[PDB]
A paper describes a structure:
Unlike Wnts which have promiscuous interactions with Fz receptors, Norrin specifically binds to Fz4CRD, but not to the 14 other CRDs of Fz and secreted Frizzled-related protein (sFRP) family members. The Norrin mediated pathway maintains the blood-retina and blood-brain barriers and regulates angiogenesis in the cochlea and uterus as well as neuroprotective effects on retinal neurons. Our crystallographic and solution studies further reveal that dimeric Norrin forms a complex with two copies of monomeric Fz4CRD.
We determined three crystal structures of Norrin, using selenomethionine-labeled protein for phasing. The Norrin protein fold is identical to that of the previously reported MBP-Norrin crystal structure. The two monomers assemble as an elongated, head-to-tail, dimer stabilized by three intermolecular disulphide bridges (Cys93-Cys95, Cys95-Cys93, and Cys131-Cys131), in agreement with small-angle X-ray scattering (SAXS) measurements which showed Norrin dimer in solution. Conversely, the structural comparisons underscore the conserved nature of the interface at the dimer core.
Author numbering:
A (entry chain A): 35 to 138
B (entry chain B): 36 to 132
Amino acid sequence: DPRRCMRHHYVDSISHPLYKCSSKMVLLARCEGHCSQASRSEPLVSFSTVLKQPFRSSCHCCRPQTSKLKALRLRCSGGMRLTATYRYILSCHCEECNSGTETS
Amino acid sequence: PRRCMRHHYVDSISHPLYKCSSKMVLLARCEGHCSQASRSEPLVSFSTVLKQPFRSSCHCCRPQTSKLKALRLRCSGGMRLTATYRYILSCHCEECN
Ligand SMILES: [Cl-]
């Protein structure tokens, strides 16, 4: 299967959203693809004194499995040094939509 | 065919805490493969701008509309206990969050 959950590389320029700084081009990684598992949702039955959520669901999303934190210094007007930080995704995997993970 | 779709089925319902005679009910569920790829990419944080590590997108086959329904169970001692559930009328692909 070629369209499966996969790591893809790309480049983006990192710039501060408010301060007009010295933007920098960086190589980044993202997770992308189609998880093989179908997503589903079915009703849960409630009874007297036994209340449950209306639906029980399953859904798999292509998300980061491992990553490495990186930081880089930008140069801004006129001498300000700002650190920017982001995760460099090392591997991807399919995981439940509602998993309690940092991506959730 | 494999798209996000309504599927019908029947299930036997029993009260988990009370002795009741099971009852068969017609149910609907959502199931399928949403067309959109799911993805997750990093968010850039700065010294005073603290963000989640990732920005993600993911589509799930879930109920779009539904109807609350109810039925009377027959239980021990001529007791009638209520059970309730949502009957899914339509399905669609929706963001995980
Ligand atoms: Cl129907």
